Amino acid sequence: SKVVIVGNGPGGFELAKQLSQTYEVTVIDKEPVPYYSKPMLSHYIAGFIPRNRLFPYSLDWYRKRGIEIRLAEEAKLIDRGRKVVITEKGEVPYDTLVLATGARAREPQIKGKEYLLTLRTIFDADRIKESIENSGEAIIIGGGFIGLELAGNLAEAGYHVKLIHRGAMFLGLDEELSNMIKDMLEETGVKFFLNSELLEANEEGVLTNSGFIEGKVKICAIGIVPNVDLARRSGIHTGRGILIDDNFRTSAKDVYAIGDCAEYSGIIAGTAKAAMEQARVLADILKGEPRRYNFKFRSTVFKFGKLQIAIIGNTKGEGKWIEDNTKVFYIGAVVFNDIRKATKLE
Ligand SMILES: Cc1cc2nc3c(=O)[nH]c(=O)nc-3n(C[C@H](O)[C@H](O)[C@H](O)COP(=O)(O)OP(=O)(O)OC[C@H]3O[C@@H](n4cnc5c(N)ncnc54)[C@H](O)[C@@H]3O)c2cc1C
């Protein structure tokens, strides 16, 4: 059976590894480079690792695994009729198609948006790296993991970092925890502008409700937009993401979707860890081992400079400190710099 996978992010890459010893697997990705770790891109940008350390396996490793890897190749249409994927280089037949098309950075729509950078690919990381090497500074607009990772790693490398954020909540956490994360990153050298909204950007900085912040390098990190256009124009139903059932099946026979592009009951997980877990569960399902991925539960650890933080389950309840570095909810936990305690609470 030919399994074709569009996308070689952590979703598609993990799926391919899990299926290649069993099926005839082809991966199609429009980027000209093999799989690289996105969670490590801030580390690269800040100068802590060489660009090559982002690449865990060479092209020969896809070879050794029996995975046909088609790079610098964009899928234009899915011919469900035939059943083939049409790229610009040609046509790729499938018995099973999995869409792992991921997401793009939400683009800013303000006056002066042409001065704002986003971060999604290694190529964005390269441009951001060269811009902060030219300037010695960055302004970050946002405050999910990408913005805080970036700001934390940049400050730790000794760049001037300014972070502009609406409201005062970070990572969807309560205001106490959000303030603690802020304080810890401040001590590291991050200058925060909370309760602050962008009105416009120009060459030399950004205007907010509460003033003008100087910086020629601005990076916007305000969210993602799932890539659903390939599906949409192939007659596959989409909402915010490609609409899947609890077995990752789309509205189209023989077409599945996983990762940042896939939406199940209003949820897109939005992490590499989730994307890889979905790939594993889908691999089990395709191999006739029924499995029920828990779409609700998230558990992930982020590293913002030296600060490691585990966020586990439901943190939307009322929380209580029971030990050093650990706030639990009564169903969830947040753990600062303690992987051991994070594992046992999960
Ligand atoms: C800076 C940064 C830091 C991050 N840090 C963390 C972290 O610390 N922890 C964490 O869990 N997650 C982190 N993430 C998120 C994680 O990287 C994403 O959740 C993950 O990348 C999603 O994986 P994916 O396989 O679904 O999609 P993607 O990584 O978006 O890959 C989709 C692939 O599909 C390809 N593609 C799309 N359409 C087509 C087409 N039509 N034809 C051919 N190819 C196509 C694209 O080129 C792309 O390679 C971070 C992300 C960024 C950007």
UniProtKB/Swiss-Prot annotation:
Gene Ontology cellular component list: cytoplasm
Pfam families registered for this protein in UniProt: PF1197-like_C, Pyr_redox_2
InterPro entries referenced in this protein's UniProt entry, alphabetically: FAD-bd_OxRdtase, FAD/NAD-bd_sf, FAD/NAD-binding_dom, FAD/NAD-linked_Rdtase_dimer_sf, NROR-like_C
E.C. numbers: 1.18.1.4
pH dependence: Optimum pH is 7.0 for the reduction of rubredoxin.
Keywords: Cytoplasm, Electron transport, FAD, Flavoprotein, NAD, NADP, Nucleotide-binding, Oxidoreductase, Stress response, Transport
Annotated GO MF terms: nucleotide binding; oxidoreductase activity
Thermoactivity: Thermostable.
Oligomer and partners: Monomer.
Function in brief: Catalyzes the NADH-dependent reduction of rubredoxin (Rd), a small iron-containing redox protein. Can also reduce other electron carriers, including 2,6-dichlorophenol indophenol, benzyl viologen and menadione, but rubredoxin is the most efficient electron acceptor. Does not reduce ferredoxin. Shows comparable activity with NADPH and NADH as electron donors, but NADPH is probably the preferred physiological electron donor. Is probably part of an oxygen detoxification system that protects P.furiosus during exposure to oxygen.
Note: NROR, unlike the vast majority of enzymes from hyperthermophilic sources, shows considerable activity at low temperatures.
PANTHER family: NITRITE REDUCTASE [NAD(P)H], PYRIDINE NUCLEOTIDE-DISULFIDE OXIDOREDUCTASE DOMAIN-CONTAINING
Name of the featured protein: NAD(P)H:rubredoxin oxidoreductase
Naturally occurring in which organism (per UniProt): Pyrococcus furiosus (strain ATCC 43587 / DSM 3638 / JCM 8422 / Vc1)
